[PDB]
Structure formats: C-alpha cells, structure tokens
Symmetry: C3
Subunit: 169 residues, 3 copies
C-alpha cells in the first residue's frame, strides 16, 4: 500500500561497512579505502590472529595498527582490494541532542534510539558486548560515533578520526 | 497547535485485534473473521479453560485448534460473531531491516522499536511475558510478526500464516 | 547534506526548563514564571537544604511548598527572577497512545520512546533514579507528564497541574 516508517536507508548505507572481528586459535568499522578498521581494545587483547568478516561474505586477516588504552579504541589493517564498503563520514555534521541514531553491532543486529548527551556520547540505543566496537549513525547513515562499553556509550566520530590517524605512527 | 510525532494510527488499526488470554480454574491475535487466534504454546500449557478478552469489552471461551512445539505457536478458536476486529495483514509487504515496529501485548502496553534482523525476526522493542504471544506491526499497522520469548524475538507473519493453516488439520 | 531525523526541537524547547535537585549538608521541572517547580517526594525526604540548578548555569535555593504522598509529587519554590525558562504546557493536547515522547532527567540525559498506555501513564522511555522527577514531552515539547518510579511511569500533566495548585494552600 503506502510507505512504512523505516530507517532502512541508513542501514543499506552503513551496515555494509560494519564488520565482525574474530580470533583463530567483537565489532569493527571500515573507515577508508586504504583498509583501516576501527574497533575496541578489549576485543583484541591477547589476540592470536585477528580476522575480519564483511557482510558480502568476504573474509580477511587483519593487522593490528595500534591501540589507545585511554579511549579503548584500536585500529586494524586489511589488504585493501578493489571495491571496499566504507562507513559514510561527514565531518560537517554536528551531533545535536535528540538526533535519531542506529547502533550497528553483532548476528548483525540494529538497535534504534537517539543521542542522549554529548559530554563522550550517550545513547539509549541497546548496547552490549555484541555491538561493542560497532558503528553509530544518524538517519542519514552518517557516522556519529563508535560504540564502546541502562544507557549506552560511544566515541564521537570527530575524536575517533583523530585517534585513528595518530595510531598510524 | 501542530501535529505531535506519533504512531497512534497503527494503534487504532491493530490494537483492537489483539486480545488477552486467561485460565479459569498471555497474549493473542485475531487473524481472520472465522475466529482463529494465534498465541503461544507456553501460554496454554496445562490450561483448564482458555478465555479471550477483546479491547471492546467482549469476552469469549476459546477452543484449542492446535499447537506447534517447534515455533512455540498455538491457534485458538472462538465463536465468530457479527463484527470481529482482525489484525491487518499484508502478504505483499517485505519486512526490511530498520523498519519501525510496535509491540502489542499486555495492561495493554505498546512498546516502540525497529526490525533489528530477519534471520526469526529480532527487534529492540521491549518484549516480556506480558506481550509474549502478542502482535508486531509496522507504522502502517501491517502485521510483521508474532512476539515470542536485551533483544526481543518474533515470528514472521509469513511463517505464522502457514503454521496456522497447517494446525487446522 | 540533508536533514537527519531528530527530536532536537523538543529538546531546545523543554530541556532548559528541567533542573537538577540537590542537598547541601533528583530531577525537577519549572512550571510557571512565579518560580514553582514540580519534583518527587522521595527526592526531598529528609532534605537539609534543597538546591535547584538550571541548564544555563544559574543556581538557587529552593523552598518546599508542599508534597503529596499519594502521587509521590512535590512542589518547590525559588525566587522568580527576570527571565525563567518554563516547561511548555498545552492543556488542549490529548495524550494518545503511540505518541513519541522524550524523557528528560539526569548528566542531563534524553531518552526516547512512546506513550504505551494512559490508565497514570506508561512509557518505554528509559526511566531510572536519574530522571525520576523529570519531564516527559512529545515531539512538540509539550509536557505530557512527570516521570516517577522494564517499563517506565509518569503522571499526566493534567493531574500534576491540579495537585500542584492544591499544594499551594
């Protein structure tokens, strides 16, 4: 009949770029075409072998670029091939309180909510060990933050961008 | 003044069809005019007498048509009278991830959320023993699933439709 | 680029009027210019000195006007100065089930949800000891209720208005 209210647009626009992290004898986000992926520290602590899994079926072995114990963030590196799904980033967008946000983690689950505060970034979107290290995007799909660990916490994409660049030293 | 953002439309369109189940010395959904009602198995296990209560005030004694231990579903039957409120069904609607959904259970409570995954159907709408067996509809009121038992689970209306038809054997 | 789905409008329209309550050796809401503030009883029980903190930075010492053990409500009084941010009230608005609502409490956190029932007022917006006594507004910012203590509870603004007026005796 008509159009059901949905945020699927932001899903098919951001979800592809979110991956799953594993250990061969956690969540992650594809930042740029170079193949850099932001995740969490507690996800890679004592990692024998880091593995990345895309939604399209592709599987990679990830390289630990570096981590930051302060913000619990970590950067990974995979062999950038032809055609990588990257997380939509908008450095001009200013996260206002009340903005609708989706939390993308892991089975690939999508929770809905809003920006509670911007003190870090608080959100009422269901966060857990599954989506810990996943993405946080607005209705447009623009990355607002990186989920961390009755209210959830993420790291502003602005900050995460900086920290990522510094870990590449 | 102006119009407050609301999903009341889907409420006055689906809520009437959702009923309450009891035992005379759980939730349920009115499917068709014939008087068939889908509920959960754990709701009728060891039932002395099944009772159905509509939102309009009408009260009925329900008949156990049959259950399916696999999907935890059950079908009831009440004497179809003149004028039954049926749950809006749309077999053409395809549940996409990110779609806004309401969870209708039981006091008649309405929780809001989205479709997390479609693996079953995951949703961040608050689900509990109250709405266990209730309806799950989009902003249009179209039945998306039947709630079951930090993330909730429902059964695709497509599947539930089949299983219901088979229990009528 | 474009416009991200958000309820920030209701925030910059209601949040200023919500304050924080303290005890000098809880949440509250600025009702009118006179300086009357609605809060919860359990927040002021055994209070040595009641203190009110606005979002603009202003700090006041509050006066206990009176409380109502029944609805767990309480009314405070501060020296009404020039220019007070008051909570948007609309006595003509009728709270329908399914309406989008924000819960404003305390760091100043904003949770999103809907009106579940209107029996009291039920809401799936995350409520806790933080926002206990805070505001509950629709997408327009119009006060729908006062939060109290897997589902949250508030008091209809219609009722709270009456009880407030009676405590001023």
């Amino acid at each position: 009949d008509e159009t059901p209210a949905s945020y699927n647009l932001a899903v098919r626009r951001a979800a592809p770029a979110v991956v799953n992290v594993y250990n061969r004898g956690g969540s992650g986000v594809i930042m740029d075409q170079r193949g850099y992926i932001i995740t969490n520290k507690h996800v890679i602590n004592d990692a024998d072998q880091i593995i990345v899994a895309l939604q399209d079926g592709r599987v990679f072995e990830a390289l630990l670029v570096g981590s930051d114990s302060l913000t619990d963030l970590a950067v990974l590196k995979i062999n950038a091939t032809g055609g990588l799904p990257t997380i939509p980033i908008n450095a001009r967008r200013v996260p206002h309180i009340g903005d609708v946000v989706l939390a993308i983690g892991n089975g690939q689950t999508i929770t809905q909510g809003i920006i509670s505060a911007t003190g870090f970034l608080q959100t009422d979107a269901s966060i857990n060990h599954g989506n810990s290290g996943g993405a946080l995007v607005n209705s447009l799909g623009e990355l607002m933050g990186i989920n961390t660990l009755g209210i959830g916490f993420a790291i502003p994409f602005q900050l995460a961008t900086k920290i990522m660049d510094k870990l590449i030293r």
